[PDB]
Amino acid sequence: LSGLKKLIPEEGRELIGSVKKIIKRVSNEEKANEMEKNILKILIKVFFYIDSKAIQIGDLAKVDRALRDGFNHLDRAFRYYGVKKAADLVVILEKASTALKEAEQETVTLLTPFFRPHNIQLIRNTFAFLGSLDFFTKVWDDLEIEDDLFLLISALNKYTQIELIY
Ligand SMILES: CCCCCCCCCCCCCCCC(=O)OC[C@H](COP(=O)(O)OCCN)OC(=O)CCCCCCCCCCCCCCC
Ligand code: NA
């Protein structure tokens, strides 16, 4: 995992660290390690084919928008984190989940010419876990304040209005 991590900067590594800690808290260390590796693998591949120009920046638009939508809805729901129960926030969290499903599909479409079918399934499983409404509701109801959802959302919500990759 050394090289994959030196292929993304400190900012991204901190984002992935926050996600990984939350995943640890909601499931287990094995799933957290698998999801960290999967996120790194998908990211590294996308960046690789952007840089080699096998993928054009315009082709990324669909994923970009979807991700930002997802982030935005999480930000909206995070406004009520600690003052409303997750059941009262499903209408927001569902939209986040749906947005990430869109990102999932488009990432699959983006990487089909370059990923073996097993790694396409890896994309599906990774996005399905990270974008799961069950994951979100568990996070919004059952986390301690020390689990630092604030760090993740407060890092994500800076990116909702500007293209993620340009
Ligand atoms: C698994 C998802 C894979 C999606 C792959 C396709 C889309 C890729 C686009 C990624 C853009 C991210 C930029 C962010 C800033 C940054 O960190 O930017 C540094 C590098 C890129 O920098 P650059 O030099 O390219 O700059 C670009 C031009 N300025 O980004 C990264 O390290 C990616 C880090 C991603 C970590 C995501 C973790 C959360 C995702 C799921 C949400 C789960 C919520 C859980 C709620 C409890
Ligand atoms: Na796209």
Author numbering: 145 to 310
Paper text:
The two structures at 1.95 and 2.74 Å resolution were designated Form I and Form II. Gip1(146–310) consisted of seven α-helices designated α0 to α6 from the N terminus. Among them, helices α1 to α6 formed a cylinder-like structure with a centrally located hydrophobic cavity 22 Å in depth and 10 Å in diameter. We noticed that there was a tetrahedral area of electron density at the entrance of the cavity that extended to two long regions of electron. The lipid was surrounded by one water molecule and 22 residues that mostly formed hydrophobic interactions. In contrast to the hydrophobic interior, the surface of Gip1 was relatively charged without any notable hydrophobic regions. Second, our solved Gip1 structure contained bacterial glycerophospholipids, which suggests that the hydrophobic cavity is stably formed even without G proteins as cargo. Asp208 was one of the residues affected most severely by the substitutions and formed hydrogen bonds with both the side chain of Arg212 and the main chain nitrogen of Leu308 at the rim of the cavity entrance, which connected the C-terminal tail with the α3 helix. For example, the hydrogen bonding partners of aspartic acid, the 208th amino acid residue (Asp208), and Arg212 were Leu308 and Thr304 in Form I but Tyr303 in Form II. The hydrogen bond pattern changes are associated with different configurations of the C terminus of the α6 helix, including a directional change of the side chain at Glu307 (discussed later).
Therefore, Gip1 is a regulator of G protein shuttling between the membrane and the cytosol for wide-range chemotaxis. Gip1 consists of two regions, an N-terminal Pleckstrin-homology (PH) domain and a C-terminal region. The X-ray crystal structure of the C-terminal region of Gip1 shows cylinder-like folding with a central hydrophobic cavity. Mutagenesis and biochemical analyses indicate that the hydrophobic cavity and the hydrogen bond network at the entrance of the cavity are essential for complex formation with the geranylgeranyl modification on the Gγ subunit.
